[PDB]
Amino acid sequence: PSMSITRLFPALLECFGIVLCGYIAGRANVITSTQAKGLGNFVSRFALPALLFKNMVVLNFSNVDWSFLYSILIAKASVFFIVCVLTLLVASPDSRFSKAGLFPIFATQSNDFALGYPIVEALYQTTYPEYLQYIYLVAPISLMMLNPIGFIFCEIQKWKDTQNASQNKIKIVGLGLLRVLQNPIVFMVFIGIAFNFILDRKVPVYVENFLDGLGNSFSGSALFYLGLTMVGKIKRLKKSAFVVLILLITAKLLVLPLLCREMVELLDKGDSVVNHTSLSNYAFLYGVFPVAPGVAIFATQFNMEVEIITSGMVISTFVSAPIMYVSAWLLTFPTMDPKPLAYAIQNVSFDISIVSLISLIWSLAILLLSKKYKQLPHMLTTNLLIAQSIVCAGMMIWNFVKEKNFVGQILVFVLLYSSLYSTYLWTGLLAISLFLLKKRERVQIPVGIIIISGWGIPALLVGVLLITGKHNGDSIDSAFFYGKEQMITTAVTLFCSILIAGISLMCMNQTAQLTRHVLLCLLLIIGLFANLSSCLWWLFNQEPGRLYVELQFFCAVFNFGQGFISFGIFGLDKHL
Amino acid sequence: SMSITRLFPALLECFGIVLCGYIAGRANVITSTQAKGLGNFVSRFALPALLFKNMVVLNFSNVDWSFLYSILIAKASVFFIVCVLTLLVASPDSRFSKAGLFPIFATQSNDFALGYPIVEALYQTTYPEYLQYIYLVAPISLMMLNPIGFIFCEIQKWKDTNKIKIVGLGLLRVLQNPIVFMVFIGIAFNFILDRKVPVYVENFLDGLGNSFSGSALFYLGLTMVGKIKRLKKSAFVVLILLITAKLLVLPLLCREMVELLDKGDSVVNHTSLSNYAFLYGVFPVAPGVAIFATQFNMEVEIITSGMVISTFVSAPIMYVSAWLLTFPTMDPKPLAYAIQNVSFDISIVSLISLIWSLAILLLSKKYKQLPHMLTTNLLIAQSIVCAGMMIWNFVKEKNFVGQILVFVLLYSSLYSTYLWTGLLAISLFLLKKRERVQIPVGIIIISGWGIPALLVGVLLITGKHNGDSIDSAFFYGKEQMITTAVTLFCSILIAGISLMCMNQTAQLTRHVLLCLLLIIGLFANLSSCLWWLFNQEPGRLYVELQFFCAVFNFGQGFISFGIFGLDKHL
Ligand SMILES: *[C@@H]1O[C@H](CO)[C@@H](O)[C@H](O)[C@H]1NC(C)=O
Ligand SMILES: *[C@@H]1O[C@H](CO)[C@@H](O)[C@H](O)[C@H]1NC(C)=O
């Protein structure tokens, strides 16, 4: 298989549950900012050097495939190079140097030791154990060979601020180099490299247990400190700052991994195909890691665009968790055997539905306890989140009732597709209600009649698909329970909702609470747009290709992880 | 059967992280307000996650319950005796606060932070079922003994200002402890999921539970900065009694009651269980007791000082006690390797701490004072003894001359440290009564460098070296032990005269105790020399006494560093 992809989701659950625990402790009032500063002082001055010293003392230089290492470093250097060049061209002259010195560090440095190491440990203990050392090999060399260029740029900008006009470029570039060398990772890696040759690859027995005890405490405490640093750093941004954060985070999380994969297939001349494919998949997985908090530390000590870099980190850190999941499950998809892709789709939808259901339970509890349900339009939003909770509960039933009885399977399918179709048309009803409220017309909206329609029409569609459709016993996936009749019924329900939302969207342009309501209608249309395309692909192409598999996987993710997006938009808000 | 070889790396982890936390605390790296956040993480997030994971996984079917209520009766018995005399002997205005805080302090060990790594090192590859007993005894001991103490402290709170009102307050504070209610949920979830955590939850509990085993000791080291304070005579005396109770008579009660209540029927397992039961009581006082005294705001100084003292004092007690249990085993010939290994491992920690204390005294320019000058002379000699053991472990099968050279330096250093403690005490007694400069101390230092050299010279001049000796008692045969006895008797008489001159005449606050703590050491050193001459066939009692002679000879620098080094700087 060359990838133990079943046990990736527990690693992302650990790595983001400890981050969530740190965030909860930060926002509550359990640990204030100063005490989180003390925990970070402990982590950054004791835990990371012991971990690095142990993993470089035990590091084996005989089995290291250097080709992957300098291919990944060439990729990171290329990403840094393009981002610095366009940062010099497109930024304003008054602050081109500050952006050119801090943005490529943000878009080139990864959170390897805190987040990357447990995930790679979960994915690469069982079959390919030699890939664990590449984190500790690549991250400090990348730091040492790419960070000084950024600190050089930030120090020219600091020279700009001093406006001395005396040159002596040595005084500045050596200042940047010594600021780089004061990082604990670089000189601690130097000490570990020296002691690897001094001790002859063997940790002393008197110090081994002490270093293991101090190093094993880095992961959880580091994720907890990341969660404690992350309270309240997002704030409200300004025009064009949204676009430059999108461009930087797309660069870091998208074009660096593709460059890593392309340079790995370009620079590796190995004679083994399975080793080459696993190296390419690991190269894709390495670049999707989020930005380390060291960039925000550097901007804080510099007092230099601290808000932009911190906002960039909290968005890339939140955003990479599904990007990691989707990318790794897309990478493990090809070859295999035709039949276990259905089990893979069911397992991925189950792991997504767990997190969406938990976040949806939290957001529903917040919306109910805040007593904001009585005012329009948030009542229909509460109904929508309730319907998505029934979809997720339908997956909880469907994972365990796949092969029990035909009658129970039919009832579970009817309930699950009723909830799915109700969510589908509730998006259109919310959009129509938003369009009616945007008109500022004194029209009494029949919310009770709308709820009766929304609870009856999907049930009628499920009953019609049961009565007229033919059940397919050889289909283990939920999408082919009734065959082509069910997909035709899902297309008609989705097309009517898209037409209703399309009329409301066209009314919004002519007419131009409501600040967020529109985007939840907007973001669902992209979800409904991806559902339509996989149904259109099946009639015109008789042969199910790999693109059909990729489109069905994205249909599953954008259909059943919508509660996560809804929680991210509404639930993480103050006052309520 | 005990893996006693791998105890000393565990004692380096458990006290090196505490030392790392203390240095960062005293320096100014983490101040007091910031240390609270690290404690908040450990006490609210790492410890509850740790407790929940290891009890859902452990099997209740194979737990030897006989050991469980035997260990608990011993802790209950210690609590009972300490509570009884605290009501009789204390002042009437504070009988209830002392009777409620002193016996809780003498019963809760540091099992989750300090006890768990030591038991893990000793009991993984040979007896792996003994590791689950840490997580069983410490919370059960908490629920059935802490409320009994807590009733008395709430009466004292009542005194300044209905039995439900008092006993329910003590009872409801215990279930608010994270240890107590997390153990309740883990026992329930052991039966719900049938000894299996879900795969989606396995990694989350492991990541949060492995971060306790390092961070809690760091916070324990960080909490003790500046907490020792100063105490009066009556508080020093009750503190000695309390630390003696927790670290001495509680472990001996555990061993005796476990051998009485398990009723054998285990062959090799009962003997191994008895040694482990004695080891459980040696663990120091948990830092939760100092936390407990803070929320009560009663007897805060004594309990905090007792906790910061018990963690330090228990560090050699763990090593000596565990190595004494493995002695009645193997054969007499690899017993010599066991004696050599313990002395080498003690001398490592003593030498590193001695280098620090010597550096502090030299750099701070307090050595220019005449009373502190003799301590510096004493402390340099203690550093060279420890370095001599590093040579002797590696020079045993080499040429006779190299063996002789290692032996001459080590025993020269041993007699000089022995007599240098007494001349300084005599010089301090002479300086306290006479204003004359210590001009004979220079002649004494020449003597102290010459008299050991003369003893060293007699062994070089007279050919009586016995090669069949392994460690040290037969280096020159009976001639070396006779020479060591004459040197030891002259040093004890000089120190005895200085102690007697202090009573007849009636900085100096700590100087005396460093002289005092050595006096308990030279009398135990003298008895082992007397034991060898008055006995032809070496018995088993001679083996235990010879080991104790080795520890106070080669780790004597550790006691000196703890008294003098951690005072101040300039
Ligand atoms: C990768 O290494 C070599 C390729 O030269 C070959 O044995 C095989 O393709 C792989 N081996 C292992 C052990 O993964
Ligand atoms: C411990 O268990 C039983 C106790 O009766 C016995 O086999 C022996 O003493 C020990 N056995 C093992 C395998 O440790």
Tab-separated table of N, CA, C and O in Angstrom, chain A residues 6-7 9-11 13-14 17-18 21-22 24-25 30-31 34-39 41-42 45-46 118 122 205-207 209-210 212-214 216-221 224 228 347 350-351 354, chain B residues 6 8-10 12-13 16-17 20-21 23-24 29-30 33-38 40-41 44-45 117 120-121 199-208 210-215 218 341 344-345 348:
chain	number	residue	atom	x	y	z
A	6	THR	N	-5.111	4.792	6.972
A	6	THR	CA	-6.190	4.593	7.939
A	6	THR	C	-5.958	5.360	9.240
A	6	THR	O	-6.899	5.941	9.796
A	7	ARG	N	-4.719	5.420	9.725
A	7	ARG	CA	-4.450	6.050	11.012
A	7	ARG	C	-3.895	7.465	10.881
A	7	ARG	O	-3.061	7.878	11.698
A	9	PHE	N	-6.263	10.213	10.487
A	9	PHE	CA	-7.262	11.013	11.191
A	9	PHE	C	-7.122	11.031	12.712
A	9	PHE	O	-7.392	12.091	13.303
A	10	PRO	N	-6.749	9.946	13.407
A	10	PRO	CA	-6.407	10.106	14.832
A	10	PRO	C	-5.248	11.050	15.110
A	10	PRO	O	-5.264	11.741	16.136
A	11	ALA	N	-4.249	11.119	14.230
A	11	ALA	CA	-3.163	12.074	14.432
A	11	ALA	C	-3.625	13.516	14.268
A	11	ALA	O	-3.245	14.391	15.052
A	13	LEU	N	-6.619	14.409	14.819
A	13	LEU	CA	-7.484	14.641	15.968
A	13	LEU	C	-6.670	15.001	17.194
A	13	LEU	O	-7.042	15.910	17.934
A	14	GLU	N	-5.542	14.327	17.412
A	14	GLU	CA	-4.694	14.687	18.543
A	14	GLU	C	-4.134	16.088	18.340
A	14	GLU	O	-4.212	16.945	19.234
A	17	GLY	N	-6.948	18.652	18.558
A	17	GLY	CA	-7.650	18.662	19.825
A	17	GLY	C	-6.830	19.291	20.931
A	17	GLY	O	-7.373	19.980	21.796
A	18	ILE	N	-5.509	19.090	20.913
A	18	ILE	CA	-4.678	19.778	21.900
A	18	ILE	C	-4.630	21.276	21.607
A	18	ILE	O	-4.641	22.107	22.527
A	21	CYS	N	-7.850	22.581	22.905
A	21	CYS	CA	-7.786	22.695	24.361
A	21	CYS	C	-7.032	23.948	24.779
A	21	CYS	O	-7.452	24.657	25.704
A	22	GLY	N	-5.927	24.248	24.097
A	22	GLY	CA	-5.201	25.472	24.395
A	22	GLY	C	-6.020	26.713	24.090
A	22	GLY	O	-5.987	27.690	24.840
A	24	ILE	N	-9.361	26.886	24.144
A	24	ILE	CA	-10.414	26.964	25.156
A	24	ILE	C	-9.861	27.536	26.453
A	24	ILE	O	-10.491	28.389	27.089
A	25	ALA	N	-8.670	27.089	26.858
A	25	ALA	CA	-8.060	27.623	28.071
A	25	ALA	C	-7.698	29.094	27.910
A	25	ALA	O	-7.772	29.869	28.870
A	30	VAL	N	-8.760	30.823	31.966
A	30	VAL	CA	-7.981	29.895	32.778
A	30	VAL	C	-6.515	30.304	32.803
A	30	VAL	O	-5.887	30.359	33.867
A	31	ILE	N	-5.950	30.609	31.639
A	31	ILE	CA	-4.565	31.046	31.521
A	31	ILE	C	-4.553	32.373	30.777
A	31	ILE	O	-4.988	32.444	29.622
A	34	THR	N	0.058	36.578	30.143
A	34	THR	CA	1.367	36.524	30.790
A	34	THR	C	1.722	35.101	31.201
A	34	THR	O	2.873	34.657	31.057
A	35	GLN	N	0.735	34.347	31.677
A	35	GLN	CA	1.015	32.974	32.063
A	35	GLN	C	1.211	32.085	30.842
A	35	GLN	O	2.016	31.141	30.870
A	36	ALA	N	0.493	32.366	29.751
A	36	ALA	CA	0.787	31.666	28.508
A	36	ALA	C	2.183	32.010	28.008
A	36	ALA	O	2.859	31.171	27.407
A	37	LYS	N	2.651	33.230	28.299
A	37	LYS	CA	4.025	33.604	27.985
A	37	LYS	C	5.018	32.778	28.785
A	37	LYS	O	6.062	32.380	28.259
A	38	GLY	N	4.692	32.480	30.040
A	38	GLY	CA	5.565	31.620	30.827
A	38	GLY	C	5.595	30.181	30.343
A	38	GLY	O	6.659	29.548	30.295
A	39	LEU	N	4.433	29.647	29.959
A	39	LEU	CA	4.405	28.311	29.364
A	39	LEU	C	5.181	28.264	28.050
A	39	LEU	O	5.901	27.294	27.777
A	41	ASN	N	7.718	30.228	27.337
A	41	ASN	CA	9.123	30.320	27.718
A	41	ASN	C	9.677	28.951	28.082
A	41	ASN	O	10.761	28.564	27.625
A	42	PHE	N	8.909	28.182	28.860
A	42	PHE	CA	9.311	26.813	29.182
A	42	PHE	C	9.460	25.967	27.925
A	42	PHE	O	10.480	25.292	27.741
A	45	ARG	N	12.407	27.167	25.597
A	45	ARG	CA	13.753	27.189	26.135
A	45	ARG	C	14.176	25.862	26.739
A	45	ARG	O	15.356	25.702	27.061
A	46	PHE	N	13.258	24.910	26.902
A	46	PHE	CA	13.694	23.613	27.400
A	46	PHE	C	13.241	22.433	26.550
A	46	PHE	O	14.013	21.489	26.379
A	118	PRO	N	4.012	14.531	14.666
A	118	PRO	CA	3.062	13.454	15.009
A	118	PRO	C	2.295	12.890	13.829
A	118	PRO	O	2.021	11.685	13.795
A	122	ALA	N	2.468	9.081	12.606
A	122	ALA	CA	1.333	8.182	12.447
A	122	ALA	C	1.329	7.546	11.063
A	122	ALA	O	1.016	6.360	10.919
A	205	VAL	N	23.979	6.424	28.236
A	205	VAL	CA	22.923	5.714	28.951
A	205	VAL	C	22.448	6.523	30.152
A	205	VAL	O	21.268	6.485	30.520
A	206	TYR	N	23.341	7.318	30.744
A	206	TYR	CA	22.963	8.157	31.876
A	206	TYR	C	22.103	9.343	31.464
A	206	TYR	O	21.384	9.893	32.305
A	207	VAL	N	22.160	9.750	30.199
A	207	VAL	CA	21.459	10.938	29.727
A	207	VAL	C	20.267	10.583	28.849
A	207	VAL	O	19.414	11.449	28.598
A	209	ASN	N	17.526	8.606	29.274
A	209	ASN	CA	16.192	8.678	29.855
A	209	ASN	C	15.811	10.114	30.189
A	209	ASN	O	14.646	10.501	30.046
A	210	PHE	N	16.787	10.929	30.596
A	210	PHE	CA	16.520	12.343	30.846
A	210	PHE	C	16.129	13.074	29.567
A	210	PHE	O	15.178	13.867	29.559
A	212	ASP	N	14.863	11.667	26.848
A	212	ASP	CA	13.560	11.167	26.420
A	212	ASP	C	12.436	11.801	27.229
A	212	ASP	O	11.389	12.161	26.676
A	213	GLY	N	12.644	11.958	28.537
A	213	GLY	CA	11.624	12.562	29.375
A	213	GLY	C	11.405	14.031	29.076
A	213	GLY	O	10.275	14.522	29.138
A	214	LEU	N	12.477	14.755	28.751
A	214	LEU	CA	12.308	16.160	28.394
A	214	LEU	C	11.840	16.342	26.952
A	214	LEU	O	11.226	17.363	26.628
A	216	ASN	N	9.809	14.079	25.126
A	216	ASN	CA	8.462	13.581	24.880
A	216	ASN	C	7.391	14.576	25.300
A	216	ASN	O	6.233	14.431	24.895
A	217	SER	N	7.750	15.586	26.093
A	217	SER	CA	6.808	16.592	26.564
A	217	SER	C	6.728	17.808	25.650
A	217	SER	O	6.054	18.787	25.992
A	218	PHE	N	7.406	17.787	24.503
A	218	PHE	CA	7.359	18.919	23.589
A	218	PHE	C	6.075	18.993	22.779
A	218	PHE	O	5.590	20.096	22.520
A	219	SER	N	5.509	17.852	22.380
A	219	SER	CA	4.422	17.848	21.402
A	219	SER	C	3.151	18.458	21.988
A	219	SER	O	2.611	19.440	21.461
A	220	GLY	N	2.665	17.878	23.086
A	220	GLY	CA	1.425	18.344	23.682
A	220	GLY	C	1.529	19.753	24.227
A	220	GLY	O	0.628	20.572	24.030
A	221	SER	N	2.639	20.066	24.897
A	221	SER	CA	2.808	21.408	25.442
A	221	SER	C	3.008	22.438	24.339
A	221	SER	O	2.576	23.585	24.471
A	224	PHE	N	-0.424	23.038	22.912
A	224	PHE	CA	-1.174	23.806	23.900
A	224	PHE	C	-0.740	25.267	23.908
A	224	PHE	O	-1.576	26.167	24.028
A	228	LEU	N	-2.785	28.640	23.201
A	228	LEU	CA	-2.836	29.806	24.079
A	228	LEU	C	-2.362	31.090	23.399
A	228	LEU	O	-2.824	32.178	23.754
A	347	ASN	N	-15.338	5.758	4.901
A	347	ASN	CA	-14.486	6.095	6.038
A	347	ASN	C	-14.147	7.585	6.087
A	347	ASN	O	-14.250	8.206	7.151
A	350	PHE	N	-17.190	9.473	7.180
A	350	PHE	CA	-17.375	9.264	8.613
A	350	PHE	C	-16.454	10.164	9.442
A	350	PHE	O	-16.901	10.805	10.407
A	351	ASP	N	-15.166	10.250	9.074
A	351	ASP	CA	-14.257	11.084	9.865
A	351	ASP	C	-14.577	12.567	9.723
A	351	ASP	O	-14.396	13.338	10.672
A	354	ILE	N	-17.858	13.244	11.881
A	354	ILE	CA	-17.622	13.343	13.323
A	354	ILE	C	-17.318	14.784	13.735
A	354	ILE	O	-17.959	15.343	14.637
B	6	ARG	N	19.051	-0.290	36.033
B	6	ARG	CA	18.479	0.851	35.333
B	6	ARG	C	17.677	1.771	36.247
B	6	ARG	O	16.671	2.338	35.810
B	8	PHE	N	19.416	4.321	38.169
B	8	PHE	CA	20.122	5.600	38.188
B	8	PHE	C	19.845	6.505	36.985
B	8	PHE	O	19.782	7.730	37.189
B	9	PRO	N	19.689	6.015	35.743
B	9	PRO	CA	19.184	6.915	34.686
B	9	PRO	C	17.807	7.489	34.977
B	9	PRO	O	17.520	8.627	34.588
B	10	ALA	N	16.946	6.729	35.652
B	10	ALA	CA	15.634	7.229	36.051
B	10	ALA	C	15.737	8.322	37.106
B	10	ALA	O	14.992	9.305	37.049
B	12	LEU	N	18.181	10.332	37.293
B	12	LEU	CA	18.654	11.520	36.582
B	12	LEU	C	17.515	12.251	35.890
B	12	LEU	O	17.485	13.486	35.884
B	13	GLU	N	16.586	11.517	35.276
B	13	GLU	CA	15.455	12.181	34.639
B	13	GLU	C	14.588	12.880	35.676
B	13	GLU	O	14.218	14.046	35.501
B	16	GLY	N	16.737	15.742	37.299
B	16	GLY	CA	17.314	16.710	36.383
B	16	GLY	C	16.290	17.675	35.822
B	16	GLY	O	16.590	18.852	35.601
B	17	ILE	N	15.071	17.194	35.571
B	17	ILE	CA	14.008	18.092	35.138
B	17	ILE	C	13.568	19.003	36.279
B	17	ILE	O	13.233	20.173	36.062
B	20	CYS	N	16.235	21.503	36.378
B	20	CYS	CA	16.051	22.424	35.261
B	20	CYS	C	14.960	23.439	35.566
B	20	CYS	O	15.086	24.618	35.219
B	21	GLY	N	13.858	22.996	36.166
B	21	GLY	CA	12.824	23.932	36.555
B	21	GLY	C	13.253	24.912	37.626
B	21	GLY	O	12.865	26.083	37.570
B	23	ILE	N	16.447	26.015	38.275
B	23	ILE	CA	17.393	27.000	37.747
B	23	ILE	C	16.669	28.068	36.932
B	23	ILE	O	16.980	29.258	37.051
B	24	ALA	N	15.705	27.672	36.094
B	24	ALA	CA	14.939	28.637	35.311
B	24	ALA	C	14.084	29.515	36.212
B	24	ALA	O	13.861	30.695	35.919
B	29	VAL	N	13.958	33.431	34.425
B	29	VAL	CA	13.430	33.018	33.128
B	29	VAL	C	11.911	32.914	33.179
B	29	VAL	O	11.210	33.397	32.282
B	30	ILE	N	11.382	32.291	34.226
B	30	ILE	CA	9.946	32.203	34.455
B	30	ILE	C	9.686	32.741	35.854
B	30	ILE	O	10.161	32.166	36.840
B	33	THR	N	4.262	34.752	38.483
B	33	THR	CA	2.952	34.858	37.844
B	33	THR	C	2.845	33.918	36.650
B	33	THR	O	1.794	33.313	36.417
B	34	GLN	N	3.929	33.784	35.893
B	34	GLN	CA	4.038	32.915	34.731
B	34	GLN	C	4.142	31.436	35.084
B	34	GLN	O	3.677	30.596	34.307
B	35	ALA	N	4.747	31.106	36.223
B	35	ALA	CA	4.761	29.731	36.717
B	35	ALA	C	3.364	29.199	37.021
B	35	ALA	O	3.124	27.992	36.917
B	36	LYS	N	2.428	30.075	37.378
B	36	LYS	CA	1.040	29.666	37.570
B	36	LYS	C	0.378	29.139	36.303
B	36	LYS	O	-0.430	28.209	36.396
B	37	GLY	N	0.689	29.699	35.136
B	37	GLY	CA	0.133	29.168	33.900
B	37	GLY	C	0.649	27.791	33.535
B	37	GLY	O	-0.102	26.959	33.022
B	38	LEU	N	1.941	27.542	33.750
B	38	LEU	CA	2.458	26.194	33.540
B	38	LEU	C	1.802	25.203	34.492
B	38	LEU	O	1.499	24.068	34.107
B	40	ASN	N	-1.212	25.609	35.719
B	40	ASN	CA	-2.584	25.498	35.233
B	40	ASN	C	-2.717	24.454	34.130
B	40	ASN	O	-3.677	23.678	34.120
B	41	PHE	N	-1.785	24.443	33.172
B	41	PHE	CA	-1.793	23.407	32.142
B	41	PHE	C	-1.654	22.015	32.744
B	41	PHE	O	-2.406	21.100	32.390
B	44	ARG	N	-4.712	20.988	35.154
B	44	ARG	CA	-6.068	20.947	34.614
B	44	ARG	C	-6.181	20.204	33.290
B	44	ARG	O	-7.283	19.780	32.927
B	45	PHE	N	-5.085	20.031	32.556
B	45	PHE	CA	-5.156	19.421	31.234
B	45	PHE	C	-4.302	18.172	31.089
B	45	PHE	O	-4.750	17.189	30.494
B	117	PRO	N	7.864	7.405	36.928
B	117	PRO	CA	9.049	7.049	36.126
B	117	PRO	C	10.006	6.083	36.806
B	117	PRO	O	10.638	5.276	36.114
B	120	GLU	N	8.453	2.692	36.535
B	120	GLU	CA	8.525	2.301	35.130
B	120	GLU	C	9.907	1.783	34.753
B	120	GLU	O	10.024	0.797	34.016
B	121	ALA	N	10.970	2.409	35.260
B	121	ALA	CA	12.303	1.919	34.924
B	121	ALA	C	12.608	0.582	35.586
B	121	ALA	O	13.207	-0.294	34.953
B	199	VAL	N	-9.950	4.333	18.596
B	199	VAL	CA	-8.757	4.637	17.817
B	199	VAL	C	-8.669	6.121	17.499
B	199	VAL	O	-7.568	6.666	17.371
B	200	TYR	N	-9.814	6.796	17.390
B	200	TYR	CA	-9.837	8.231	17.129
B	200	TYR	C	-9.395	9.022	18.353
B	200	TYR	O	-8.984	10.182	18.236
B	201	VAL	N	-9.472	8.413	19.535
B	201	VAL	CA	-9.198	9.090	20.796
B	201	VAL	C	-7.856	8.635	21.379
B	201	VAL	O	-7.292	9.308	22.249
B	202	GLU	N	-7.287	7.550	20.838
B	202	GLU	CA	-6.061	6.964	21.378
B	202	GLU	C	-4.895	7.942	21.312
B	202	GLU	O	-4.170	8.123	22.298
B	203	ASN	N	-4.701	8.579	20.161
B	203	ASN	CA	-3.583	9.495	19.983
B	203	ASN	C	-3.739	10.793	20.764
B	203	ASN	O	-2.738	11.343	21.232
B	204	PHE	N	-4.969	11.291	20.924
B	204	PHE	CA	-5.177	12.499	21.719
B	204	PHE	C	-4.816	12.296	23.185
B	204	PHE	O	-4.181	13.164	23.796
B	205	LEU	N	-5.214	11.169	23.773
B	205	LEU	CA	-4.863	10.920	25.167
B	205	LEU	C	-3.377	10.636	25.344
B	205	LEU	O	-2.801	11.000	26.375
B	206	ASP	N	-2.747	9.987	24.363
B	206	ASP	CA	-1.306	9.771	24.421
B	206	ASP	C	-0.523	11.072	24.312
B	206	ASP	O	0.482	11.243	25.011
B	207	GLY	N	-0.947	11.989	23.442
B	207	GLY	CA	-0.230	13.246	23.311
B	207	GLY	C	-0.348	14.129	24.539
B	207	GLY	O	0.611	14.804	24.921
B	208	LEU	N	-1.519	14.135	25.176
B	208	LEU	CA	-1.700	14.898	26.406
B	208	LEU	C	-1.159	14.172	27.631
B	208	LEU	O	-0.841	14.818	28.634
B	210	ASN	N	1.575	11.970	27.653
B	210	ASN	CA	3.030	11.977	27.632
B	210	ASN	C	3.609	13.346	27.952
B	210	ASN	O	4.814	13.446	28.203
B	211	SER	N	2.788	14.398	27.947
B	211	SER	CA	3.290	15.724	28.287
B	211	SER	C	3.205	15.994	29.783
B	211	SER	O	3.640	17.053	30.244
B	212	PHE	N	2.635	15.069	30.555
B	212	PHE	CA	2.658	15.221	32.006
B	212	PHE	C	3.983	14.749	32.581
B	212	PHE	O	4.484	15.322	33.555
B	213	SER	N	4.562	13.699	31.995
B	213	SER	CA	5.696	13.006	32.594
B	213	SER	C	6.966	13.845	32.611
B	213	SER	O	7.996	13.350	33.075
B	214	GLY	N	6.954	15.027	31.998
B	214	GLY	CA	8.121	15.881	31.930
B	214	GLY	C	7.848	17.266	32.485
B	214	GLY	O	8.666	17.843	33.203
B	215	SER	N	6.677	17.801	32.142
B	215	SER	CA	6.201	19.116	32.559
B	215	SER	C	5.823	19.241	34.028
B	215	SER	O	5.951	20.331	34.586
B	218	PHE	N	9.021	19.695	35.985
B	218	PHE	CA	9.528	21.040	35.739
B	218	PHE	C	8.769	22.056	36.580
B	218	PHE	O	9.371	22.977	37.142
B	341	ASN	N	29.547	-0.065	41.475
B	341	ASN	CA	28.608	0.693	40.648
B	341	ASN	C	27.833	1.755	41.426
B	341	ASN	O	27.616	2.857	40.910
B	344	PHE	N	30.289	4.680	42.171
B	344	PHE	CA	30.550	5.485	40.984
B	344	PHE	C	29.366	6.395	40.664
B	344	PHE	O	29.562	7.578	40.367
B	345	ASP	N	28.141	5.868	40.722
B	345	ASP	CA	26.945	6.643	40.403
B	345	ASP	C	26.644	7.746	41.415
B	345	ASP	O	26.155	8.812	41.030
B	348	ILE	N	29.261	10.715	40.707
B	348	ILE	CA	28.957	11.566	39.557
B	348	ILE	C	28.121	12.770	39.968
B	348	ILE	O	28.469	13.916	39.659
